[PDB]
Amino acid sequence: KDLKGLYAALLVPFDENGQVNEQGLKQIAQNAIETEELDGLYVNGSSGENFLLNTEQKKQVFKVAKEAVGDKVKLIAQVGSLDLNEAIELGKYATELGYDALSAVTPFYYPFTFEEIRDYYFDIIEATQNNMIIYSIEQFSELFNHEKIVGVKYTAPNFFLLERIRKAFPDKLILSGFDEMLVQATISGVDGAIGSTYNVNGRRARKIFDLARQGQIQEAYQLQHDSNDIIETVLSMGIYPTLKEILRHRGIDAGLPKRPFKPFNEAHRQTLDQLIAKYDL
Amino acid sequence: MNKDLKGLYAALLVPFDENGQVNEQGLKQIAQNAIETEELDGLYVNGSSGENFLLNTEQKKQVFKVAKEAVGDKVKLIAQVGSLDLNEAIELGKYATELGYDALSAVTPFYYPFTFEEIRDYYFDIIEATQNNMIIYISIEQFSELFNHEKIVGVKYTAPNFFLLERIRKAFPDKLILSGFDEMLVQATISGVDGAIGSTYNVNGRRARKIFDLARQGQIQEAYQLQHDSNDIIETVLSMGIYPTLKEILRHRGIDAGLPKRPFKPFNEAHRQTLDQLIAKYDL
Amino acid sequence: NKDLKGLYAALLVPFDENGQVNEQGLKQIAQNAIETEELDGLYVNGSSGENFLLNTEQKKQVFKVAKEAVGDKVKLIAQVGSLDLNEAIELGKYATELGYDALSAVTPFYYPFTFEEIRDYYFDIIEATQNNMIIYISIEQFSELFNHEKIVGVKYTAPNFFLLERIRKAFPDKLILSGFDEMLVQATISGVDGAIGSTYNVNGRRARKIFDLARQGQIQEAYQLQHDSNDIIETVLSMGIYPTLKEILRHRGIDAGLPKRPFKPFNEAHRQTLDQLIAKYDL
Amino acid sequence: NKDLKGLYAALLVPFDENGQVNEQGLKQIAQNAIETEELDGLYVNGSSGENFLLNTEQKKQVFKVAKEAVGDKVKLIAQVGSLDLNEAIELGKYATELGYDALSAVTPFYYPFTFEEIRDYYFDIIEATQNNMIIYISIEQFSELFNHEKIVGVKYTAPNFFLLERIRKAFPDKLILSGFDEMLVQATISGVDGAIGSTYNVNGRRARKIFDLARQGQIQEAYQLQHDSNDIIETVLSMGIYPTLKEILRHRGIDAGLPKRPFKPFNEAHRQTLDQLIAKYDL
Ligand SMILES: [Cl-]
Ligand SMILES: [Cl-]
Ligand SMILES: [Cl-]
Ligand SMILES: [Cl-]
């Protein structure tokens, strides 16, 4: 699979004890593809509350998400972990399930050197033999020299650096991670995008992407205005519980956020009701 | 009428002699280069790019006078008069206004942690004393309060944040927005800016105008290709010392581009070959 | 109940080439801290132990080995913080059952958690474990955390001596343990109750003198020992702090193993400079 | 040639409604610093003096008045830094001609100047004035700056006590004056030669006691005085430091005038809390 296109960053529903609700998760995954008409799912990224999960729950998410959608759906498995043994084990498990590529967040918390960051990606690639999507221009170059590093999920909203990476690496995949600047990413030549709000707003996101590349820039930007009202509202109410409340409105068992995230605050119910009416969410 | 000042502006560079005095003939050549050669809509005079904050009050007036004399009546003129000395800001604002500059602008008061009310009344005091239109440099609720002033016509927007820019464009459809980041002109353009102010348009304003025009005509691919070209230029000049290097490019065209004012140091000759290579490649 | 004041080694962990805990060396490292470095306690599974690189089973393994290594009088604090609250609760219960004197938990990180989220993360761990807790934010918020009788103190790592003085003043009944070895003398005169540090694994004798001399008002001599300690700290930082501390320990005949990847091993290009440091300061 | 050790008031300036210096109030403020606060010297035309808001003639005016207000024993440091280097040299010569013991200059700001540009700005002022200079940057770059015979020290304002300790150790013979009032006690035990502060205009007596007691090793008493000083500092920062400090002086019968716009005057809604602090601390 060419990995171009638009991906929902897959949300995960939990019960009160922080266990995955598998029925709700299957429904969320199918919502992304069938209702929001997206190209694929980005599984166990930050938007999935991945970093709050134990290893067996991560595996549980990968399997459920894979068995919920058809064979033509593009699937990217985020497997980064500060525990490299865990990253490799998740990488092998996702590869065996048939995920089209892995990705891995930059090793964090500790001040890792670039050399340490580089060999963390190279070690995961070596053990899994799958394609890898990563998260400075001389450094990018050394990462992207690797033929199995097919791309970057670019989340730093610096359009100068984006433009430099675009031109420097015309043949690698660039997927942007900032929903609220989709139209700017699009005219900057990204090959697609990954976003949490595409779970509820993937149809507008598609129009933004398509229309911007078709020269219809005013129309794409108007839809960005509309999408940015939604994104701003959802951010102000607590992004992941509120996205899942919007889904729950659709009859989906969207459950609860995993503690220490708190549930949607009902003080926001009226404003959320107004948003959902305004934009037909 | 808030949109009268739309368009593309050179942030006017200033040549100095060895004692940090304005070279007036070189300044006239720079102003004329921006309008006649680079084909820009106007000059932004005494901003950061003119080393404004290194100047005494007399030198600022001198630059305002010469820039204005150098251009025809149809060329748009914006006078940056911000200063931590509010008395000086008012003096320069009155002076620039009597000269016939079409608006004033003023950088956000800096150095000290000023409160928003102090920043607000800094602008309100300049406006009250000069009665000219004002362009500002802060949340959306804070923008709303500043833009409720009939004489605050718009903003020169330099924050690298396209979420806030979009929010501002949506919230203030009839205010002037001019972007100040040359390396993101194409993104600013599709985000609905009414124009741009740039130091690199002194040497690259023809590409800048094509980027602006092609992007608004939806020729997005061709606009973006010109942004790649411009960004090679911008990245190169930033790496050599922006103001001195821009002036060296101007010197190549036969302009009396002089020196930067200390404590900026002159163009370092170790960069000479890399610069000549850039000038040849992009025909600068 | 033990008094928790005093000086603690942040316990380092030796690994084999597969990132598995070396139980033999871990025991030697724990015993070095108490018996050679003369420290009051161990701070187990903190950042310095490469805790955030471990799986749950390995964290329990380290808790168990450290406890087994030390006498009944040794103070033991178990860092159980995790982005996975279920894991943090489970490690908290396990360490309490081992008999650890207090738990601590890093601030939930990575995500932009609200304060109420952070507060209730601490309160949740407490309800489940019933152990005393040490936290890692304005004075107004500290008040809300310290209001809890089971939040007994703070391991204070932010390099800001104005916030430190305010917290000391406002909360005279709470334990403050500073985590910046290179500013021990400044923390001591600011009234901290003790300190936790990774370099006390190799420089614990000098740290005790800094602490004691400074409280006794012999400030000039404490500050000279801070100069000497900071030569060591700067050097060790410039070489990769965790691998280098463990190299110094190896020199005393401890099986200090390897760091866990993605941390890289001690670069041998540093060996001569490290040999010199060990000679100069008799480490 | 005066030694420059000790405690300096960062001289506050009173203005009228048009932003002109109230010269009579300025003398009162200079004299209060030396005669009531019992301070060693005055730091003139720094940030606390609203210096960067002034025109050249006003800066000269402030230098002249402050000098004439104090006796021959008083140490005087003239801050002459400006983004206009021609103005800085002019001010440098003027202050030198009036007999200021040293010059100082803030780090060139606003633009992103290279270290080579910052270095040559200092070197240029020194070369035109021939006076001693205090600077405001890594250790290697400090080593290059301090290699100049006429760079005699540094007004150290970065709240970083690891770098302070490194500088103190690497430059045993240079003058280090700290600029953080709220951390005077930590600076003192770190071996600073003295301190410059705006709050010493109203609290120099406590400041001196903190400085002397800490150096005499009565660290518990010095720390308590810092608790009281930080109460004051935390309150006046919360109300707008410059205007509030001057309001405290007005209360002493001093003509404290107004701040220069765009600073706003003291807001009367803080009156109650201020009166209460002045009461508690006898200011
Ligand atoms: Cl994600
Ligand atoms: Cl400018
Ligand atoms: Cl630790
Ligand atoms: Cl000052």
Residue numbers in the entry:
A (entry chain D): 3 to 137, 148 to 293
B (entry chain B): 1 to 137, 147 to 293
C (entry chain A), D (entry chain C): 2 to 137, 147 to 293
From the paper:
NAL catalyses the reversible aldol condensation of N-acetylmannosamine with pyruvate to yield the sialic acid, N-acetylneuraminic acid (Neu5Ac). NAL is a class I aldolase, functioning through the formation of an enzyme–pyruvate Schiff base formed with Lys165 which carries out a nucleophilic attack on the aldehyde carbon of the open-chain form of the N-acetylmannosamine. Here, using the NAL from Staphylococcus aureus, we demonstrate quantitative conversion of a cysteine residue, site-specifically into the nonproteogenic amino acid γ-thialysine, chosen as a mimic of the natural catalytic lysine residue at position 165, using the double alkylation-elimination method and that high yields of an active, modified NAL can be purified. We then characterise the resulting enzyme activity, analyse the pH-dependency of catalysis and use X-ray crystallography to investigate the structural basis of the changes brought about by modifying the enzyme.
